[PDB]
């Protein structure tokens, strides 16, 4: 008994956010665009979330990575 | 199966892996950037994946010195192929013994 995925569909990506001066990385999601919003999700399957700071860890500031994005990330 | 088949496979598994990663071994093929398929094989490691992003470059260049290195110590060494000139040996050794 196997598990086998299906209908794909396209997105845009980035390495990491950018928000007050400092690198915010995933957990163990990918970061996700459709449009003017950005979310993160699991590899396997499409679920979409708000960006928190339960989801992500900070390291440095957004100054030596190749490929870096202005947003702003939710604040509990 | 002639030289230049098997050489199209292999030109097809590696284009596979280079624009997929392991996703194409279990069901349709996906598309991904290389850098963050590699960190995410750091992080099968045990390595937090920011340490890949700050240290490209330095990652680039070894990975080509070493390809280029290997090209140099496959060339200089002359008995490196061994085990298959071994066989070729064998079975002419074989074949000329039963025809005298
Ligand atoms: C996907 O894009 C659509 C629009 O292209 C977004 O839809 C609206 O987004 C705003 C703000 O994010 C919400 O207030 C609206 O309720 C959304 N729907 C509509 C019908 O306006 C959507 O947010 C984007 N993301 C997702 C996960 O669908
Ligand atoms: C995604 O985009 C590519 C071109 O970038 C296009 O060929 C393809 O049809 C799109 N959709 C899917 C599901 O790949
Ligand atoms: C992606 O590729 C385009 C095409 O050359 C380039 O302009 C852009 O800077 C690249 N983005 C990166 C490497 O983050
Ligand atoms: C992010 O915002 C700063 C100012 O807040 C700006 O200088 C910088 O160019 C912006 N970068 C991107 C990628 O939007």
Redesign the pocket.
């Known amino acids: 008994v196997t598990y086998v995925p299906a209908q794909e569909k396209n997105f845009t990506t980035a390495p990491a956010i950018?928000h007050d001066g400092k690198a915010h990385f995933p957990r163990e999601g990918v970061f996700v665009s459709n449009g003017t919003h950005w979310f993160v999700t699991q590899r396997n399957f499409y679920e979409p979330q708000i960006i928190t700071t339960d989801n992500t860890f900070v390291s440095g500031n957004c100054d030596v990575v190749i490929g870096?994005?202005?947003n702003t990330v939710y604040d509990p | 199966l002639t030289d230049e088949m098997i050489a199209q496979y292999t030109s097809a598994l590696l284009a596979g892996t280079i624009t997929s990663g392991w996703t194409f071994g279990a069901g349709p093929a996906l598309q991904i950037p290389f850098p963050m398929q590699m960190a995410y094989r750091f992080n099968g490691i045990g390595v937090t994946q920011n340490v890949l992003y700050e240290n490209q470059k330095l990652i680039a260049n070894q990975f080509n010195s070493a390809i280029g290195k290997i090209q140099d110590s496959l060339s200089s060494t002359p008995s490196a192929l061994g085990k298959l000139q071994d066989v070729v040996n064998q079975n002419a050794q074989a074949l000329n013994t039963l025809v005298k």
């Open positions: 950018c870096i994005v202005n």
